[PDB]
Amino acid sequence: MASMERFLSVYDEVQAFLLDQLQSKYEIDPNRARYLRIMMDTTCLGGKYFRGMTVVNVAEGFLAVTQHDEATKERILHDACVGGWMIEFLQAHYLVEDDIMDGSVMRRGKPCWYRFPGVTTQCAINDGIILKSWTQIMAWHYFADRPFLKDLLCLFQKVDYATAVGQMYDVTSMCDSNKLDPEVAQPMTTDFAEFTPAIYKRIVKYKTTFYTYLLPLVMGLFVSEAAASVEMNLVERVAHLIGEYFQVQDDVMDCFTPPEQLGKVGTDIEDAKCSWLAVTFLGKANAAQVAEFKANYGDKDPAKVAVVKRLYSEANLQADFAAYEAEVVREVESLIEQLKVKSPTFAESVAVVWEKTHKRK
Amino acid sequence: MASMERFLSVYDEVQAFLLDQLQSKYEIDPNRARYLRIMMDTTCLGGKYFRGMTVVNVAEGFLAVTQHDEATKERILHDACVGGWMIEFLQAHYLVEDDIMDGSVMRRGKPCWYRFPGVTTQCAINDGIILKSWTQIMAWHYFADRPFLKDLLCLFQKVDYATAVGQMYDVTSMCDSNKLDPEVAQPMTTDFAEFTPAIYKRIVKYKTTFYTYLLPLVMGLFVSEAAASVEMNLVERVAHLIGEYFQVQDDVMDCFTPPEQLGKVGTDIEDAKCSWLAVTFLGKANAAQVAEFKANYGDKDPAKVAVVKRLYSEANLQADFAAYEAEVVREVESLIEQLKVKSPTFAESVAVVWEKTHKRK
Ligand SMILES: CCCCCCCNCC(P(=O)(O)O)P(=O)(O)O
Ligand SMILES: CCCCCCCNCC(P(=O)(O)O)P(=O)(O)O
Ligand SMILES: [Mg+2]
Ligand SMILES: [Mg+2]
Ligand SMILES: [Mg+2]
Ligand SMILES: [Mg+2]
Ligand SMILES: [Mg+2]
Ligand SMILES: [Mg+2]
Ligand code: NA
Ligand code: NA
Ligand code: NA
Ligand code: NA
């Protein structure tokens, strides 16, 4: 789409600005510049640009209905593209660090960044850190005299902390809460008692939904000077809901979508993750199924990993996913209807977000 | 000292505020709260509090010479203690991530955080990330209606990016710049051509000096509303200079101070780091010494590591350190003299910083 190439063109302005500032102010040599260019490209490009392109979609919505000089339209769009790139760079940061914490092997149809031969965990940890400072450098440079700067930085902060807290819920999702202890090596749960819908929901709310839906949506609002034109409690509710669905889909695909289709390789079963599959399976399994699940979950072993998949397929989780999906369609449509009271344009941007999410892979 | 306990008392307000906000807003359970409390304590406490206590020292300086109501004094101090803790928490972040990137084993006389049995690299990477979000949570909560908020956040940003860039110079300091390549596994340098004073200076400027001296000093200025009362080009120069010295000392101690005295275990020789020892040794060695150095540097091997130490001792680097030190005394005193034109009080805070630095371990 033309609009996605126009987005990428702003990626090139930003890359150019960051790398020139490295040379002019940070005493960098061409070879490290080159390494940081390739790192930026590898970690930030080749996704679908969903987060970034949402910020742009929202802004366009308000421009269709709003009186502006042409130079104001151009600036709003550019600000939305820049804000889009903050969020894509924030994602890049999270995926680089996440792939380390998950012992992942592939991302966007390539090796995880830290697995590149000339990278390694040593460098990629820091590269992940650079990725997020860049989001701040962008904000302070591009949005220096913007009315929304302070509101934006503060929202960005808050989304980032929630996501890190959520990551903590995720990485410890396989241990018994009463057993967490810096001093003692953590055992994997044997009862699976904390694999419940409530616990799963909390994990997903934090680790995924703030940065993937709340941020892009409210960002689109901020660059638009349009936050007073929506019910922010509704933005939060619908972002948290669509974001949960997004993760459930992510959980399903980890187990059931071919790696050549997915672009990554699934590790949830081996990582013992609290995925939607695991929770739902335990929500409907009989006594014997639970025992066989417990014997196999959370082991690298191919005969074990494979057994968990047959336990999943045979428990007819498409039924459960279909009823889950149907309830979310209900509730998202409703939240949409509700946002139309104040903001027909925003509600429509939300319909598009929902539709693009609902039919992905 | 009473003043250090008063500092710690603000650490307890902040810990309490962060952890209560975790319970009240982030749906945290007591056991993860407990893990995050212990993590905070382990990574943030038990140092000398040099960075934090500088912010307080500077503020006190201006309070001695400035008319304020008593309630204004109390607030300025509290703001300086809070700003101090931002910097200590930012250090905590850097040391947790640094110890991962350096395969370190001890820190402040204990195991590195990631080596705690119930931690591991998986969790500590994220814990290091949490540490820095906390610095932003503090700033936005404590300094919400402060005139200096925006200037502070922007300085904080800029210091953090420089330090990450510097970390990149550090971690790649042992590879030939023309050989950096994400695609190819990096070889350690055989010529050691980039072990020069200019290259070493650049590494140290960025990785150490911004966060350890520039930030605390200017922070003290910010909380004091006193930035217009100093020559900021002089603050930068003297922070960069004392900070370089600080690192040189850090480089010396890694090789020559007993681990029971130091609180850490040295890995520079084994990591092949571009330390001040390595650079100076190559600055004065003869042909034969260079060859024997090259045969042994950058290997875990105890007979190799040990040989580099004898090459260091026998090359009389105390001579070189003493001439280095003497030149820095000259230049720091001068910068001090120069800061007295505008700010006798600040220059005196700088004398104290210098004196405390100059006589450490
Ligand atoms: C500090 C790191 C924060 C990470 C944010 C959550 C990243 N989640 C996405 C992944 P998840 O399933 O690992 O949660 P993936 O795309 O690997 O399936
Ligand atoms: C993202 C990590 C940034 C790290 C900032 C520099 C940390 N340096 C201090 C250490 P260094 O000698 O490793 O530079 P140590 O105290 O281990 O001697
Ligand atoms: Mg993952
Ligand atoms: Mg993960
Ligand atoms: Mg996943
Ligand atoms: Mg280190
Ligand atoms: Mg280091
Ligand atoms: Mg050191
Ligand atoms: Na211990
Ligand atoms: Na258990
Ligand atoms: Na490759
Ligand atoms: Na070489």
Nearest chain B residue to A177, by CA: B31
Q: Which of B40, B90, B129 to mutate to test binding with chain A, by most A CBs within 10 Å of its CB?
A: B129
Q: Which of A280, A94, A274, A294 minimizes the C-alpha distance to A170?
A: A274
Distance CA A358, CA A245 (A): 8
Question: Can you tell me which residue has the tokens 């350890």?
Answer: B212
C-alpha dihedral sign at B324, B330, B332, B335? negative
- Answer yes or no: is A170 a known binding residue: yes
**Which of A43, A45, A116, A123 is the best residue to mutate to test the B interface, defined by the most B CB atoms within 10 Å of its own CB?**
A123
Q: What are phi and psi of B186, to 5 degrees?
A: -70, 125
Resolution of the determined structure in angstroms stands at 2.0
Q: How far is Cα B101 from Cα B91, in angstroms, rounded to an integer?
A: 15
Phi, psi of A266 (to 5 degrees): -75, 140
Beta partners for residue B111, in sequence order: B106
Q: Does A150 touch chain B (CB under 8 A)?
A: yes
What experimental approach yielded this model?
Answer: X-ray
CA–CA dist A141, B21 (Å, integer): 31
CB contact under 8 A, A171 and B126: yes
Give the integer Cα–Cα distance in Å for A92 and A88: 6
What is the phi/psi pair of residue A175, to 5°? Answer: -115, 155
- Ligand 12 centre from A308 Cα, in Å? 51
3-state helix, strand, coil in chain B (%, to 5): 75, 0, 25
Question: Hey, is A152 helix, strand or coil?
Answer: helix
Yes or no: say if B94 and A126 are a contact pair by the CB < 8 Å rule: no
Strand B110-111 relative to strand B106-107, pairing: antiparallel
**Could you tell me the CA-to-CA distances from A62 to A11, A151, B330 in Å, in that order?**
23, 19, 62
Q: Which two tokens stand for residue B341?
A: 């034109």
Backbone angles phi, psi at B105, to 5 degrees: -115, -35
Decide if A141 touches B, using CB distance below 8 A: no
Tokens of B39: 């993590």
CA angle A271-A277-A281, nearest 5°?
115
Tell me the residue range of the domain where B360 lies: 1-361
Strand, coil or helix: what is B175?
A: strand
Interface of B with A in 271-310 (CB under 8 A): none
Find the closest chain B residue to A27 by CA distance.
Answer: B202
Q: Give the C-alpha distances (Å, rounded to integers) separating A71 from A76, A77, A78.
A: 9, 10, 11
* Cβ B336 vs Cβ B347: under 8 Å: yes
Residue in the block written with tokens 């090359």: B315
Q: Is the CB of B107 under 6 A from ligand 2?
A: no
Nearest CA in chain A to B121: A101
Contact present, B255 and B275 (Cβ < 8 Å) = yes
- Residue A184, chain B, CB below 8 Å: the answer is yes
Residue B151, annotated ligand binder?
A: no
Per DSSP, what are the bridge partners of residue A188? A175
Spell out the residues 6+ positions from residue A314 whose beta carbon is closer than 8 angstroms to its own.
none
Q: How many angstroms separate the CA atoms of A124 and A100, rounded?
A: 8
> How far B274 CA sits from the closest chain A CA (Å)?
16
Q: Please indicate whether residue B97, judged by its CB atom, sits closer than 6 Å to ligand 2.
A: yes
Angle at A356 between CA A351 and CA A358, to 5 degrees: 90
Between CA B95 and CA B68 the distance in angstroms is: 38
Could you tell me the CA-to-CA distances from A171 to A98, A128, A273, B166, B358 in Å, in that order? Answer: 10, 18, 8, 30, 43
Q: Which of B122, B126, B100 is nearest to B111 (CA)?
A: B100
Question: Can you tell me which residue has the tokens 């600000």?
Answer: A79
Question: Which residue, by CA, sits nearest to atom 16 of ligand 1?
Answer: A95
Per-residue tokens: A58: 């929202």
Where do we find the tokens 């903590």?
A: A168
A261-266 contact pairs (CB < 8 A, 24+): A261/A361, A262/A361, A263/A106, A263/A107, A263/A108, A263/A109, A264/A104, A264/A106, A264/A107, A264/A108, A265/A104, A265/A105, A265/A106
Structural Rg of chain A based on CA atoms = 21
- Please provide the size of chain B in residues: 361
Which of A130, A250, A267 most suits a substitution to test ligand 1, by most atoms within 8 Å of the C-beta? Answer: A250
Quick check: A126 contacting B, CB < 8 Å? yes
Nearest to B126 among A26, A101, A180 (CB): A101
Q: What is the DSSP letter of B187?
A: P
* DSSP string across A133-196: HHHHHHHHHHTTT-TTHHHHHHHHHHHHHHHHHHHHHHHTTTB-GGG--TTSPPPBPSS-TT-S
User: Is B23 touching A (CB cutoff 8 A)?
Assistant: no
Q: Which residue's alpha carbon is nearest to atom 3 within ligand 1?
A: A94
Judge if the beta carbon of residue B296 lies within 6 A of ligand 2.
no
> Which of B34, B84, B26 is CA-nearest to residue B54?
B84
The residue behind tokens 């072990």 is B195
Q: For the domain that residue B327 is a member of, what is the CATH number?
A: 1.10.600.10
Q: What is the DSSP letter of B181?
A: -
Instruction: Identify the bridge partners of residue B43 per DSSP, sorted by sequence position.
Output: none
Structural domains in chain A (count): 1
CA separation, residue A31 to residues A129, A357, B178, B180 (Å): 20, 40, 6, 7
For residue A163, the tally of other CB atoms under 10 A from its CB is 24
What's the CA-to-centroid distance between B98 and ligand 2, angstroms? Answer: 5
Residues with CB under 6 Å of ligand 1 are A 94, 97-98, 102, 163-164, 167, 170, 207, 250; B 126, 129
Tokens 């802004």, located at residue: A59
d(CA A233, CA A227): 11
Compute CA B19 distance to the chain's CA centroid, rounded to the nearest angstrom. Answer: 26
Closest chain B residue to A170, measured at CA: B123
Alpha carbon distance A239, A249 (integer Å): 15
Instruction: Compute the distance between CA of residue A107 and CA of residue A264 in angstroms, rounded to an integer.
Output: 5
